[PDB]
Amino acid sequence: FSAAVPFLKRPTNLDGQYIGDVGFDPLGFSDVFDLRVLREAELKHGRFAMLATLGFIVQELYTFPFFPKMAPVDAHDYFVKQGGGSQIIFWISFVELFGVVALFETLQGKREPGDFAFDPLGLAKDEATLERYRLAEVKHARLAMIAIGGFIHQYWVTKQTVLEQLGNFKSL
Amino acid sequence: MFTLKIVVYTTVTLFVSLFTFGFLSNDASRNPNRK
Amino acid sequence: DRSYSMPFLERPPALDGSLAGDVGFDPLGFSNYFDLKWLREAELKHGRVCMLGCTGFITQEKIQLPLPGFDNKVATEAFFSVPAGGLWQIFFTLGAIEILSNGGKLAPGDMFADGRAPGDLGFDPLNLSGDDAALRRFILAELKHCRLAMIGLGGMLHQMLITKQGPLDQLANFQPIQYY
Amino acid sequence: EALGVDDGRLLVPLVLIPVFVALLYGNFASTQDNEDFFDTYDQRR
Amino acid sequence: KAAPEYNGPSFREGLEYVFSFVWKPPILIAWKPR
Numbered sequence: 001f002s003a004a005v006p007f008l009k010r011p012t013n014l015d016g017q018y019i020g021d022v023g024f025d026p027l028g029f030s031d032v033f034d035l036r037v038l039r040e041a042e043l044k045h046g047r048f049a050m051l052a053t054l055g056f057i058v059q060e061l062y063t064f065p066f067f068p069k070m071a072p073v074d075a076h077d078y079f080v081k082q083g084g085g086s087q088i089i090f091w092i093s094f095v096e097l098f099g100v101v102a103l104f105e106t107l108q109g110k111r112e113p114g115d116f117a118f119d120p121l122g123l124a125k126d127e128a129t130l131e132r133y134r135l136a137e138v139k140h141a142r143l144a145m146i147a148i149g150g151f152i153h154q155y156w157v158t159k160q161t162v163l164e165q166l167g168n169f170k171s172l
Numbered sequence: 173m174f175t176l177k178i179v180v181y182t183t184v185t186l187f188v189s190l191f192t193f194g195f196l197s198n199d200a201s202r203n204p205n206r207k
Numbered sequence: 208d209r210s211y212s213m214p215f216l217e218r219p220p221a222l223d224g225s226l227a228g229d230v231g232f233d234p235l236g237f238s239n240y241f242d243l244k245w246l247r248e249a250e251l252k253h254g255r256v257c258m259l260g261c262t263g264f265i266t267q268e269k270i271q272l273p274l275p276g277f278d279n280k281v282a283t284e285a286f287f288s289v290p291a292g293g294l295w296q297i298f299f300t301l302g303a304i305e306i307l308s309n310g311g312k313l314a315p316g317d318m319f320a321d322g323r324a325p326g327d328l329g330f331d332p333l334n335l336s337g338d339d340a341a342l343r344r345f346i347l348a349e350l351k352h353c354r355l356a357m358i359g360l361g362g363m364l365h366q367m368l369i370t371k372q373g374p375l376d377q378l379a380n381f382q383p384i385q386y387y
Numbered sequence: 388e389a390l391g392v393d394d395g396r397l398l399v400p401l402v403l404i405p406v407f408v409a410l411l412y413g414n415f416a417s418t419q420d421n422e423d424f425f426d427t428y429d430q431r432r
Numbered sequence: 433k434a435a436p437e438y439n440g441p442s443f444r445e446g447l448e449y450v451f452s453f454v455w456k457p458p459i460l461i462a463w464k465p466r
């Protein structure tokens with residue numbers, strides 16, 4: 001009785017415990033792997049994308065003076081060589097060791113998936129506000145993971161940055 | 173030549189130290205008549 | 208229930224408030240599988256070794272003893288310049304301090320066999336560890352300085368290996384990595 | 388020429404290895420009853 | 433000067449645990465088939 005797809009039945013383990021659940025698990029990935037590990041991944045991919053989308057937009061409008069001006073994707077290449085790339089990899093890796101410890105905790109059931117307990121500015125006042133926001137994040141992560149993939153492929157073809165392409169559509 | 177020499181020195185020093193400290197580990201007590 | 212340092216994870220069981228410097232950061236849980244007294248003795252000894260060492264890298268650059276070969280500003284370079292025998296004489300003197308300080312009980316099983324709360328090798332010449340409250344807070348400082356020094360010495364050693372320059376000098380006349 | 392040591396690096400094995408083993412022996416030594424025996428050899432081990 | 437008793441695993445078990453960090457980390461047990 002999946003709500004999102006009336007026809008298909010709700011996948012057995014998608015019961016709405018995690019927020020963002022519309023029963024959309026057509027290919028049944030839920031049954032094969034632990035749902036908790038998957039939510040961790042949904043949000044972790046989403047979080048990179050929700051940031052990257054901001055970056056393609058910001059990198060286009062402005063770049064710091066010390067770096068040469070380049071299109072957003074081009075930079076994956078200059079930075080592989082200037083060595084900035086390694087730094088951004090070293091740190092994101094360091095944060096992730098703690099992430100392996102965090103996951104193992106989720107598997108032992110002692111951590112809600114996706115919770116690093118970071119709410120510095122304390123925006124989440126109430127358990128409802130957390131449910132409102134928590135859903136919003138899951139929706140944005142899903143939109144963003146789609147959009148970042150778009151910004152990149154459209155550039156691989158148009159060879160135009162996203163805001164420039166919007167200005168000059170330059171249809172194939 | 174230096175690397176072979178340092179490897180040989182490491183090996184010889186290890187075995188000689190093992191021999192020396194093994195015979196220092198109350199070797200006379202390792203007899204069947206010890207109680 | 209939760210570590211203070213890492214809120215997401217659980218408080219490492221072994222860590223309770225009693226050891227000093229305990230904000231619960233043992234994510235990989237070494238505490239569960241080794242003796243905290245052995246571990247603390249090492250957290251302290253590496254720091255005490257790198258409080259002397261970090262100060263050493265800075266002092267050597269500014270001032271060097273009159274004897275020949277004690278003249279290389281870069282610590283890493285100096286190790287080679289100084290006479291080798293002297294470096295071994297230092298090794299041995301330190302080695303004696305080890306055996307006498309630990310009383311010959313120098314192994315994981317026996318070092319703490321008699322008393323010896325970790326790191327109490329007895330050096331309190333000016334008694335400052337008489338107040339307990341004072342001792343509990345000085346002990347946090349030593350660990351916080353030991354932990355920073357460890358990180359600092361590694362940084363200075365690696366940054367010198369690239370720059371062939373002592374820490375203070377590299378900050379002056381800093382050049383990007385490509386130049387070196 | 389003192390031990391055939393023409394390169395200082397040769398002295399790192401000649402010292403660290405005997406010390407390390409000695410460290411293993413020190414634990415054996417601390418476990419022994421080290422009071423004096425009036426005998427030809429010490430049977431305590 | 434806290435001195436916990438540590439009635440726990442031996443040193444060899446700790447070394448084996450540290451090695452299991454690099455040959456058997458909890459990374460892949462999160463994804464387990466049912």
Ligand code: CLA
Pocket residue numbers: 245246248249250252253256297298299301302303305306309312313314315406410
């Ligand atoms: C005759 C010389 C001599 C002797 C007999 C001793 C005797 C002793 N020392 Mg040593 N020490 C000496 C000289 C000496 N010291 C000198 C000159 C220094 C430098 C100033 C030190 C520095 C030192 C430190 C820093 C420590 C000791 C410790 C000890 C005690 C335990 C020994 C042991 O089991 O280690 C046997 C040898 C080993 C186990 C090998 C060392 C282990 C390696 C180096 C760890 C590598 C970790 C790795 C890099 C991190 C992973 C990275 C990640 C990316 C994977 C013992 C009382 C330890 C102690 O008290 O523990 C409670 C301790 O922590 N000593």
Ligand code: KC2
Pocket residue numbers: 289290291292293294296297300
């Ligand atoms: C704090 C650790 C330490 C201790 C406890 C200690 C004790 C004694 C005693 C016992 C009381 C004697 C008798 C003695 C004698 C000499 N020491 Mg000394 N010494 C220590 C440290 C260093 C360093 C770091 C160096 C050094 C030197 C010499 C030389 C010069 C040789 C020469 O004339 O060329 C001679 C004769 C230098 C060196 O050997 O250079 C080749 C040199 O770098 N020592 N030393």
Ligand SMILES: CC1=C(C#C/C(C)=C/C=C/C(C)=C/C=C/C=C(C)/C=C/C=C(\C)C#CC2=C(C)C[C@@H](O)CC2(C)C)C(C)(C)C[C@H](O)C1
Pocket residue numbers: 050051053054118119120121122123124140141143144146147148150151154162
């Ligand atoms: C957590 C935490 C904190 C925090 C925080 C942060 C950092 C929050 C940051 C949140 C962000 C940045 C969310 C961003 C979402 C981005 C989205 C949804 C992108 C949508 C793009 C779309 C729909 C598109 C598109 C497009 C496509 C694909 C291609 C184009 O041709 C067309 C088009 C333009 C239509 C703080 C300290 C504040 C407080 C706290 O105590 C704890």
Ligand SMILES: CC1=C(C#C/C(C)=C/C=C/C(C)=C/C=C/C=C(C)/C=C/C=C(\C)C#CC2=C(C)C[C@@H](O)CC2(C)C)C(C)(C)C[C@H](O)C1
Pocket residue numbers: 232233234235236237252253254256257259260261262263264267281282283285286356357358359360361
């Ligand atoms: C000055 C002197 C020089 C020398 C000097 C010599 C003596 C240098 C002495 C050096 C040594 C002893 C410094 C040790 C540093 C270790 C630090 C950085 C720690 C990392 C542990 C932290 C990050 C951790 C964390 C961990 C926590 C605790 C618990 C875990 O669950 C989690 C985690 C794994 C994350 C030389 C000889 C070159 C010559 C020079 O002329 C003069």
Ligand SMILES: CC1=CCCC(C)(C)[C@H]1/C=C/C(C)=C/C=C/C(C)=C/C=C/C=C(C)/C=C/C=C(C)/C=C/C1=C(C)CCCC1(C)C
Pocket residue numbers: 257282283284286357358359360361362364
């Ligand atoms: C050099 C060479 C030549 C000279 C002589 C010689 C003997 C031949 C030799 C000397 C050699 C020796 C002395 C060289 C070896 C040297 C030094 C002492 C190694 C230091 C390593 C520091 C590591 C990378 C730390 C990273 C700190 C972490 C990120 C802090 C993490 C933190 C925790 C986890 C969490 C909270 C906050 C954050 C900040 C995130």
